[PDB]
Design a protein around this nucleic acid. Structure first.
Ligand SMILES: Cc1cn([C@H]2C[C@H](O)[C@@H](COP(=O)(O)OP(=O)(O)OP(=O)(O)O)O2)c(=O)[nH]c1=O
Ligand SMILES: [Mg+2]
Ligand SMILES: [Mg+2]
Ligand SMILES: [Mg+2]
Ligand code: NA
Length: 383
DNA sequence: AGGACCC
DNA sequence: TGGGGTCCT
């Protein structure tokens, strides 16, 4: 019961989409801008020292000939992201999305159908496609090695189909679980693929420098670990199960330690259609107030249309806000409510604006002036 | 309703 | 002053 998982990772996704629309950008160094930020940039601009989530000024002062395009509206990038998933879904139905530009696919069944199709005389013609992690030697008598190679071939067909059908280039990694597949897809980039043979799993896991580099250990947990004297993957492999549990809870503790040995038994889940649809807008305390109402019509108008196209219906609405000052209490507030059934299905705007407005007043004292740096609307709980 | 994680 | 997502408590 050993698995063959692939993880697909598109290079500089937003920038790829922009370069495809307007090829006059193909060669100019390029950055996708949202508010005062460069969210992502193309491979030219990385050479020139530009980095993700570097502010627009710094970015000019590191490459003054940087061409900027606004990527605040995600429609185009969202659309392409589902084209990619659907294409992978043709290979094996069971595809898991992670943000807009990553997918996992469980290739185990396909690897097996393909192996059954070969007889014993070509089981030695099976070769690898792309890189072998750490240059490890292949052993054709090892069935795990054989399965992973067929994996690497299926991964190659997926990358070729993505390029031929949608114009997108990307990396893939093939491995025995999601964690390893994701760690190894990054080893050669851009636009290349790597396969991880089992013997090299400790080599891979120990190549990391910071324990935050393990998917599943975020900002909070890292920071908690560092303060316990846990810095390397090895520190975490070797630390007291007992003290860790007590510091994180048998859940978080027992899972991140398993992760630390490269062990990860989570299955690849079919993502299908989204569980929620939301729109945001950020500002430098640029709302107080009434203007909130306008801002909230905008998001709403855009969403209604997205939720119409889908043709499932939301049965809950949520309104999210954030308050001014500063490096302090920067956690957010929200208020949700069921959407009246009469409404579930022109003119839908007006009633909606009002629910939203009521939700708004529940949160903000609209007498003593307000400090708003974010407005968000979410539709969810659909069927 | 908030909090962790992911891109 | 990114703009989205997922699942758990
Ligand atoms: C990590 C991250 C990505 N993104 C966006 C930008 C990216 O186009 C997309 C996926 O990000 P990544 O896959 O992390 O990076 P990338 O795809 O832009 O470039 P590459 O993978 O070749 O390094 O999602 C954010 O908006 N915020 C984030 O914190
Ligand atoms: Mg990517
Ligand atoms: Mg995706
Ligand atoms: Mg991490
Ligand atoms: Na490979």
């Amino acid at each position: 019961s050993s698995r063959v998982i692939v993880h697909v990772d598109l290079d500089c996704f937003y920038a790829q989409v922009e370069m495809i629309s307007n090829p006059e950008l193909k060669d100019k160094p390029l950055g996708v801008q949202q508010k005062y930020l460069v969210v992502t940039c193309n491979y030219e601009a990385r050479k020139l020292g530009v980095k993700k989530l570097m502010n627009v000024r710094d970015a000019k002062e590191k490459c003054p000939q940087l061409v900027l395009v606004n990527g605040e509206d995600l429609t185009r990038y969202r659309e392409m992201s589902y084209k990619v998933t659907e294409l992978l879904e043709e290979f094996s139905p069971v595809v898991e999305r992670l943000g807009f530009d990553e997918n996992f696919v469980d290739l185990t069944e396909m690897v097996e159908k393909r192996l059954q199709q070969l007889q014993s005389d070509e089981l030695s013609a099976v070769t690898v496609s792309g890189h072998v992690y750490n240059n490890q030697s292949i052993n054709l008598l090892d069935v795990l090695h054989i399965r992973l190679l067929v994996g690497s071939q299926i991964a190659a067909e997926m990358r070729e189909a993505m390029y031929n059908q949608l114009g997108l280039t990307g990396c893939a990694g093939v491995a025995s679980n999601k964690l390893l597949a994701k760690l190894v897809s990054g080893v050669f980039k851009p636009n290349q693929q790597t396969v991880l043979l089992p013997e090299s799993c400790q080599h891979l896991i120990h190549s990391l420098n910071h324990i935050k580099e393990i998917p599943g250990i975020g900002y909070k947990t890292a920071k908690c670990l560092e303060a316990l004297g846990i810095n390397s993957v090895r520190d975490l492999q070797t630390f007291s199960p007992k003290i860790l549990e007590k510091e994180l809870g048998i859940s978080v503790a027992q899972r991140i330690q398993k992760l630390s040995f490269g062990e990860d038994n989570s299955p690849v889940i079919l993502s299908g259609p989204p569980q929620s649809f939301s729109e945001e807008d950020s500002f430098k305390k640029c709302s107080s107030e009434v203007e909130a109402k306008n801002k909230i019509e905008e998001l709403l108008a855009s969403l209604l249309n997205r939720v119409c196209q889908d043709g499932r219906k939301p049965h809950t609405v949520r309104l999210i806000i954030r308050r001014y000052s500063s490096e302090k209490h920067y956690g957010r507030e929200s208020r949700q409510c069921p959407i009246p059934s009469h409404v579930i299905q022109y003119d839908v705007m007006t009633p909606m604006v009002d629910i939203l407005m009521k939700l708004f007043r529940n949160m903000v004292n609209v007498k003593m002036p307000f400090h708003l740096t974010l407005l968000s609307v979410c539709f969810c709980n659909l069927k």
